[PDB]
Amino acid sequence: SSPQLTFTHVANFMNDAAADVSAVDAKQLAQIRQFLKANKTNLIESLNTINKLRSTIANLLQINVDNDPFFAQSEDLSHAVEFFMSERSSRLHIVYSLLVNPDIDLETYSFIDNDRFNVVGKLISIISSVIQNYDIITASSLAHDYNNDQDMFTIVSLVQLKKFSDLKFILQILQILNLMILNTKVPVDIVNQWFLQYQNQFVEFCRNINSTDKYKFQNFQDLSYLSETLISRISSLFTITTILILGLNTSIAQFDIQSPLYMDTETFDTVNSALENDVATNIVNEDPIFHPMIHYSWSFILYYRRALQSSESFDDSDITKFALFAESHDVLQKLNTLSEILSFDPVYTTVITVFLEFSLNFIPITASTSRVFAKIISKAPEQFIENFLTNDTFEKKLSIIKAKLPLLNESLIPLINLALIDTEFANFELKDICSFAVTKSSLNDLDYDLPDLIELKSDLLVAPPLENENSNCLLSIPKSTKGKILTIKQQQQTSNLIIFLYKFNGWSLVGRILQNLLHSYMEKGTQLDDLQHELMISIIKLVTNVVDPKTSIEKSSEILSYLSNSLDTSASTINGASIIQVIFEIFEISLQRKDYTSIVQCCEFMTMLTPNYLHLVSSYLNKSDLLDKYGKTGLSNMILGSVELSTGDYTFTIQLLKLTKVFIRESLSLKNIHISKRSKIDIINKLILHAIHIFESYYNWKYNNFLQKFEIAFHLTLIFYDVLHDVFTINPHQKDQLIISSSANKLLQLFLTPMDSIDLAPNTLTNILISPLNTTTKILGDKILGNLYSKVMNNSFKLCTLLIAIRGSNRDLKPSNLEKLLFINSSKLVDVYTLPSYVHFKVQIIELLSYLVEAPWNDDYPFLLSFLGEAKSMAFLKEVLSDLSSPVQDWNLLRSLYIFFTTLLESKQDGLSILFLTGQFASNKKINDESSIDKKSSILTVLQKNSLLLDSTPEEVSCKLLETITYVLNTWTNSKIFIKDPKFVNSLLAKLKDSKKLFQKKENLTRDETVSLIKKYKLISRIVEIFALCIYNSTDSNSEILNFLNQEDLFELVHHFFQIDGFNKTFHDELNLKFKEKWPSLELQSFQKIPLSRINENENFGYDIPLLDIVLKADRSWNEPSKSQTNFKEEITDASLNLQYVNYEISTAKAWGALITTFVKRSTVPLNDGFVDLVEHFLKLNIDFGSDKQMFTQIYLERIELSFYILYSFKLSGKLLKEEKIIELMNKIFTIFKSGEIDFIKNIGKSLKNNFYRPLLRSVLVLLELVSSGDRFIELISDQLLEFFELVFSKGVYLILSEILCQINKCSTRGLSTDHTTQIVNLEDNTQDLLLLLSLFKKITNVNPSKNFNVILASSLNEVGTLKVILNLYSSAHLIRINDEPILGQITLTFISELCSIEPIAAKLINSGLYSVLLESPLSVAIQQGDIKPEFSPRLHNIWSNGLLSIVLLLLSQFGIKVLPETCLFVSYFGKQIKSTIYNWGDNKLAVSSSLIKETNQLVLLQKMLNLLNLVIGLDSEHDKKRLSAALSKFLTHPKYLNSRIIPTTLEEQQQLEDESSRLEFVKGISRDIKALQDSLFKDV
């Protein structure tokens, strides 16, 4: 059936597409909109709804069984409950997503806009219904007691989850309702319903749940503190909703009087009566029914409403009672607490800011009010802050403060508090103060002349604000200063003040006041007044805002200069006077006295001071005692152990972690070279030590605020990952250049530990990974409350993946304990994978599993199937199958699943792979047979289904699908279920044919064009690999691939895939050069990426852009290049794509070569002319020096091999081809073999790279086997053939034999190393000298050579020198023993016979006298000694005997009477062996074989031939022939005697005797040959 979409998946998709709607796939977007248009009423209306355990939980859910079929038949009831919660939350997620961004579906959005207030009323009714059944029925259901205890625990846990989910549901509905009713005119019906159900149901519920004074484990503060945390948010949101319904508007920053509430005279009465009833019955309960904000704002609403009308009647009877109530209930601190609780969303900050701006008119600005305003308003958006600061009422109230400014509590403290709103506003109000107000008890001390206009006739000394009494510092007012005297009460609804106009700076005054406060801080001690202490903290915070990096370094420096003008010069610890030193002294004193607020504020100051002033922070951290110094515990640990571990607040720890993050990032920069490396290294090491100390213990602390625990783990996992990533994934050829290398090494040592280790860092990481299975983590970590937990989790997943990758890249590192922990906790990750509420954690889990499986284990291998089990593995398979087959699917999830399948197929996890492929466990291996795959529960079915959607599927997903298919095909299975339906092969062929976008490839490609080319290459490589496998496994079943390969125009399509021309060496070399003059301290290769794994194959080429951004963040040339300057960012981005392009081009060339090779191997029919054209193309490509740049010289080798085998395949078939192409190929192969990248002449290549010229040698040998090419181009043919012949033969033979001389004696002063055993397998003489050279010699001699060719050959041989090296190698054979026998002489005779076969060479060599020279050798004398028999060395002895007889016979036959004396002396010297053989044959007891018959026939042929061409002992006299004939008559009559005398001494003789014996052939050959020769002799005589 159809899987059908669910609300959770649609909500996840809309969350993904909430940023950019156009960025998502258009078809998926259209299908999502089609789903939305069908479900328009089910979003909200379906929420409304007006065997004992299942009935109890069904009553708990307040929904019928048949209403939820998924809940009905779910085996695990917890899964059904989780699914129902997820669907209920996802409906409102969809509604909120539509409200926030209407562009997702404008048709469904309009369904809400036209029915806005009906939806609002429905939301209020739903909130009331949820509150009604929150505890009335759930508590009764929990109170039930049937039997068992595990069921009771499960029911209790489910009830607690349901209650917390109900609270989260209320929070969600409140968020949506506040979004809807904002800046809208609320009808009086909604107002009445809200003001009725708020008093009737909401406040009592909140108070009852807050105080529960009206199963033991997992019910402590881990549970009770949760409800108190949620109820506070719920009450704050009720307060905000009540404020919004009254008519607050953020567009005008004022209450909307024209709302229907105030135009109705009856609904106004109900609200007024409700507030009056709340006021009049307050004292019974100290907490009012309505928040003091509501009464406090109603006071102003009533005042404005009365002022709009004419009559007022009573004034204080009704207007002022609400104000008095609010003031007596401490409205300001309640407002501050309300602002603090609602900090998660920025809208409520705007609401409170506009409320404060509205209330400005009725509030005089004082110390407490200014403090509250600074605390609240400073977090508002910039536009609302500007609106508040530009208000006319605020300006008028600020002018009064600024009038009489230097009065401490009156004006100075409120102005300092107001300065904490905006930095530019503070600068404007503090830079140019132009008023000085002085109060004096006695007027005699002032010499002023005279109604308020006075003048000063002398200089005046006035003590500055908060000046020490003993200090001599005073402020001087010059004479002739106009003054104004004020002695009357302030005119708003004071002492004798005198105000002079005096232009002075306020920053200097504030700095002097701060120094004075420091002096009293270290004099009195810790008993400083709160007013002074808070003034000090406020001044420190103001300077912190001043020194913020958001300010320009110039103006920050100017302000800090202003702040230090009036400081005392008595201090001399550091030259000059600075406010930074004052704040540092305050920090040290506060650290000594354990003052939490002061240290927190100073740590914030020092955290924000780092980016622009690092030479001060580093110096302080060196001098201060906050960090450990040589075995001495620092002040930070003293505070953490005593103060923070008892109070439960860890603001200082989080501030320290933030400082660590900022310090590391600023130290990695390039503008901080003026700071020494050693200080930075020491400080970074100390900070990393502190961070590691914090990491191993924070998880067991007690937290008053739960979010703080998320704020710590977020900062810890963010520091480790950056340090490890910047070091272990960059700079392949170095390991310690970066300043953070030591910290990275120590972190790697701590995280990766051997098996026996028990270190707590891997345990903490693993505990973080499996957190979502906790109840408190499920509740607090939900996305409704916030997204900090999700960031924590993705950081942890990234860190764990990076650690596994780093370990896997080193063979020396043994398997770590973290991987064993992950293997043990592997069934706890499948649980997270299958959780309905966690669908944004699937890709990361799958990637982690793939990385874990890919890791190599040497000693012992852990099996995933053994850890998961039989039940947990099947659930994983079901979830994976459900994910694979969905109507709408995520591309990232599909890609990750394909990568996971590919990785699992390569690994040794055979059980899991078998389960995934076949759907059944590997334990039942007997089931494996034909049709033994469960089609319903196998990945193969889904692979087949998705393989046909190549056009719709994106190219990455399809290419990885093809990788998985190839891995399935090549090794795991032989039955090709894929090719049963030809649709797959047809789709592959269509993609290959229409993939012709590879035409231009050069015409100034853009970035997107290059990316598309890369993807196309990646797809085509996999396609041709699949085709190669399909054609190889089956010869003729895939007739369509054969037809595609047999087409006429294949060559034009495939010829460009074998050429690699997409690399720009000049571009890649000028970029590296130009990077070292702009920034000479850096080299571009330092930022090169390191490939750690194939799972991250896409991001493995080029340079790291984030690291370059970190290093060069402060450089203008990197960030804002000019028009006349190069753009290094874009060039580096381009250079990273070229490497990937070249890599995939080479891969595609390799795959195409493999496919063509495997096609040519099997084909038997004659090939087309397209392959001749392809061979010509390959040879020309090698002509143009395809390896001069050393561009992956295996392309050269594969081209050579392809050309050789295509040429060789023409021998098996006919292939009648013209001689012109033969000549072209022959000339091109000569030009390849001479000079160029090949190293045959230099003799260096032959010893090492013998594969670069041996295919060429066989190609030359077998290409000449075609029709003889010696007629048409006989001139060029002869010239090229002679050149190639001499160049190969003379040089190779001379060099090989010179090397042999080197191993036997001193050839070129290299040294003498004569020995029986040397080098390996005759170097190349075994193959390169006798397999090819003599064969090509014979081919030329069989090619009808001309006399002029022989003459030129002889001339070249004389120029080189011949047969001297032959005698030298014969002496080598004398001095070299192989298998305890001299075997190198078997080829000397062959070479001699080949040389002597032709007349000119033989005639030229005989003049040098080969006979005596070869006879003088000791082996020749040993052979001449006689008594040589085949019993000793049959094969070799017959070989040399036949060789010498053949050469003697041929020379005698060819040459005339000028050689007869030489032959006569040769046979006289060699006659002893012949006589011994004759005597042995006459005496019998000798093994005679076919070789002996051949030797006897050759001797007989030489005899009478040395006679008639006018000696031979044993054959000259006729008596010898008579005796031989008598012996012949004796033995020829007894074949059985000959068979008995025959002894098989040769393998061929043994084989012949085994098969029907050999006596018949032996006797027949002997009889025929001997009778013929005897008849010839008798006729001649």
Numbering used by the authors: 9 to 58, 69 to 232, 242 to 477, 494 to 536, 549 to 1565, 1585 to 1655
Sentences reproduced from the published study:
Nup188 and Nup192, two of the largest subunits in the NPC, are evolutionary conserved homologous nucleoporins. Since the density maps of Nup188 and Nup192 are not completely resolved in the IR monomer map, we next performed SPA of the purified Nup188 and Nup192 samples, respectively, and successfully obtained the full-length structure of Nup188 at a resolution of 2.81 Å. The Neck domain is at the corner followed by a crescent C-terminal domain (CTD). The clamp, Neck and CTD domains further form a large right-handed super-helical ring that resembles the letter “S” comprising 52 stacked helices. Surrounding the axis of the “S”, two layers of concentric α-helices spiral up in parallel and are referred to as the outer/inner layer with respect to their distances to the axis, which probably enables Nup188, like a spring, to stretch and shrink to a certain extent. The overall S-shaped conformation shared by Nup188 and Nup192 may play important roles in regulating and maintaining the malleability of IR.
Nuclear pore complexes (NPCs), embedded in NE, are the massive bidirectional transport channels between the nucleus and the cytoplasm. The NPC is the largest proteinaceous assembly in vivo, which consists of ~550–1000 molecules of ~30 different nucleoporins (Nups) with the molecular mass of 60–120 MDa from yeast to human, and are the sole gatekeepers controlling the nucleocytoplasmic transport of macromolecules. As the core scaffold of the NPC, the inner ring (IR) attaches itself to the cytoplasmic, nucleoplasmic and luminal rings (CR, NR and LR), and is directly involved in the formation of the central transport channel of the NPC. In summary, our cryo-EM structures describe in detail the hierarchical assembly of the scNPC IR, which consists of 192 molecules of 8 Nups with an 8-fold rotational symmetry.
